[PDB]
Each structure stands twice: as structure tokens, then as C-alpha cells.
Amino acid sequence: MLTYAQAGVDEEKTARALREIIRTARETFKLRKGKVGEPGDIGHYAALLDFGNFYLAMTTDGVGTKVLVAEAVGKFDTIGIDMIAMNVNDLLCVGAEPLALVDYFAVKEPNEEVFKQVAKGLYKGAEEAGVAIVGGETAVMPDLINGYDLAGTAIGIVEKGKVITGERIRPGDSVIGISSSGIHSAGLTLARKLLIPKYGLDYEYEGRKLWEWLLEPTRIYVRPILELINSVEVHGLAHITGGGLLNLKRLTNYGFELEMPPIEGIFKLIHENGVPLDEMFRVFNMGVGFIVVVPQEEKEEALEILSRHYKSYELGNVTRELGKIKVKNYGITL
């Protein structure tokens, strides 16, 4: 087909349905007014709860339908990495250090093989993120779940005065992208429906099977970002998840002028199957898993720090074209 909506995930409809839940949530903030745990507003990558000298950051994230690929090939060995990565990467975007995670595992059956595989990736992700897995919930629910749905909730800590929300972003700031490991965990419904029936899961593309491209575990950005924020002045941090580059608009009203990396790997296969390029930058990470915004004079030091850990790119600059994201080398405006 063409779009994420036609694949079954209508982001516009989802936002419409969610307005009532978000309004209700905001009404509950007053229940902790002036007390420990008093929250900030909803809409950012994590909630910030006032504990006096510090904020606790709290976020919740699932893997999505990536688990349907894992099931077909009997490899849940890295789905736990995906779940941990999505949660801890979101914590970083308020400037918090990730501490602990609980997982929610909703399954059609208590399959011992699936669970042993899930456990392997949970450890690898936890070790790379520096977090303890401290508890969880397992729900065997075959009438409600057609596979093995893995989600979780993570908490982190950020000192008062060191929160990074994006309000410090100014025009002229440099925009830097850290490469993704691949598709990560966003847009799998479109990728699965577009490619699997046409090509088959065993289709071989640049020496890897389609399932390998679809299952590649999400990259964890904790070490480079925690190093970065303790060395250079950071104005904004954005984990590229659902919404793609639109996630930058959660940080600032200022505009962005970007040059994005070449379209490669699975993203090229998807593009060559008719998804419009503007939709692609709103759905897939397109090679950039994480974006940082720093003062222009810190650009080279930031790149030196990030490049120790992962391939990183100077993407562009913040502008006064309020509310616009110009992908200059593709002629796209979001």
C-alpha cells in the first residue's frame, strides 16, 4: 500500500481518541498538588515527579508488533533489548539517568521456550542500559492476545536545575543525529504488511533475510548521552520513535533545517515499495535513532563524544521557520 494508516495504525485517529484520557489525566494532577510526587505536564518523553531535591522521571513503552516476527522464527532473544531500549532512551530525553524497570508480559500461553529467550535479551539490555529489572507482571490471556506482547515501565532520576526539556533550544543551535541500528521498534505494522506477503520472511536483501532486518534490536543510547550531558551544554534530546522526525516538535517551537543520511537497508526496500518519502520520515527513524541539540560552538566536541560510541552525523541547525522541519536534501517539509 502506501501509508501507516492504511496498514492499520492511524496516528491522527489515535490522538483524537486519546484527548479524553489526557484531559482526565491532567485533572488528576491536583491530587498531588504541593505534595511529594507532584507531576509536570503530559506530552514529553517522560513524566517528571517532584521529590524535592530531584525529579523522578517515569515512562512506559511497548515493543509493538515486532514480536510477530520474533515468534515466526522462534527468536525472542532480543525482544527484551527492544523493550528496555525504548523505555531508557525516553528517560534520557528529560536528562535523567535510568535506574530501574518493570516489565509487563501479556502472552497467549506460558511458553517456557519463549520465556527463556525473552530472558536472554532482558539481561543484555539491562546491562548495557545500567538498569535493574526489579519486577513485573505476567498475564496469560489467549482470548485477548495473539502472541507475546512485551512492554515495560522505567524510572530515572534528574537533579533539579538539570532537566533538559528543549526550552533552551535557540535558533542557530546545531542538530546532531546518532545512527540507529536499523528499524528499531517503530513502523513495524507498515513494514510487516508491506513486505512480508510480497517477499516472504526468507527474502534475502543485502545478505540478510527479511526477518533479520525486521528483528534487529533497538539501539541503547544511555552511555553516549549520559557522557554527553556531563561534558557539554545540551539544549535538547529526542529519541526517534513513533512520529519519526515529528518528535523534534515536542522540544521547541523553532524550526529545523536538516540533511538526513542516505536511505539504506530496510528503509530503502520500504521506499522502493511505494511509501511516500514524507510519510517515511514521519514513521521510520530513517537511519537516525536519536537527535541532540547543542550550542553551535559545542558541535565538534559533542560529535567527538558521541562518535566514540556510534556513528554520528551533523544534521543541521535550528531556524526561525517556526514549526517546520525541512529535510533539505530530500525536498521534504514536515
Ligand X SMILES: Nc1ncnc2c1ncn2[C@@H]1O[C@H](COP(=O)(O)O)[C@@H](O)[C@H]1O
Site for a second copy in 37-56 (CB under 8 A): 37-39, 42, 46-47, 49, 51, 56
State yes or no: residue 40 binds ligand X (CB under 6 A). Answer: no
Residue 98 bridge partners (DSSP):
156
Judged by CB under 8 A, how many residues of this single chain contact a second copy?
84
**Helix or strand holding residue 271 (H, E):** helix 265-271
Q: Which one of 22, 31, 140, 144 is in contact with ligand X (CB under 6 A)?
A: 22
* Greatest C-alpha distance within the chain: 58
278 binds, among ligand FGR, a second copy, ligand X, none (CB under 5 to 8 A by kind): none
Three-class SS state of 290:
strand
Q: Which one of 55, 62, 174, 177 is in contact with a second copy (CB under 8 A)?
A: 62
State yes or no: residue 137 binds ligand X (CB under 6 A). Answer: yes
The piece of 132-140, 159-167, 296-304, 309-317 that touches ligand FGR (CB under 6 A) is: 132-140
Distance CA 131, CA 136 (A): 14
State yes or no: residue 18 binds ligand X (CB under 6 A). Answer: yes
State yes or no: residue 110 binds a second copy (CB under 8 A). Answer: yes
* 142 secondary structure, DSSP code: T
The piece of 60-68, 69-77, 111-119, 261-269 that touches ligand FGR (CB under 6 A) is: 60-68
State yes or no: residue 161 binds a second copy (CB under 8 A). Answer: no
Q: Please state whether 42 falls in left (phi above 0), alpha (psi between -120 and 50) or beta.
A: beta
State yes or no: residue 125 binds ligand FGR (CB under 6 A). Answer: no
Q: Which is nearer to a second copy, 64 or 287 (CB)?
A: 64
Distance CA 214, CA 69 (A): 7
Residues 168-207 that bind ligand X (CB under 6 A): none
Distance CA 267, CA 246 (A): 17
Q: Which value, in Å, is the radius of gyration of the alpha carbons in the chain?
A: 20
Q: Which one of 139, 200, 204, 323 is in contact with ligand FGR (CB under 6 A)?
A: 139
Bridging pattern class, strands 325-327 and 332-333 = antiparallel
State yes or no: residue 110 binds ligand X (CB under 6 A). Answer: no
Residues 174-203 that bind ligand FGR (CB under 6 A): 185-189
- Among candidates 301, 288, 188, which has minimal Cα distance to 248? 288
State yes or no: residue 103 binds ligand X (CB under 6 A). Answer: yes
Residue 106 bridge partners (DSSP):
139, 149
The cell for 193 is 504488511
Classify each residue of 300-309 as buried b or exposed e, where b means 16 or more C-beta atoms within 10 Å of its C-beta. eebbebbeeb
Q: Which one of 8, 37, 74, 135 is in contact with ligand X (CB under 6 A)?
A: 135
Binding residues (CB under 6 A) for ligand X: these are 18, 21-22, 25, 42-44, 103, 105, 135-138, 242
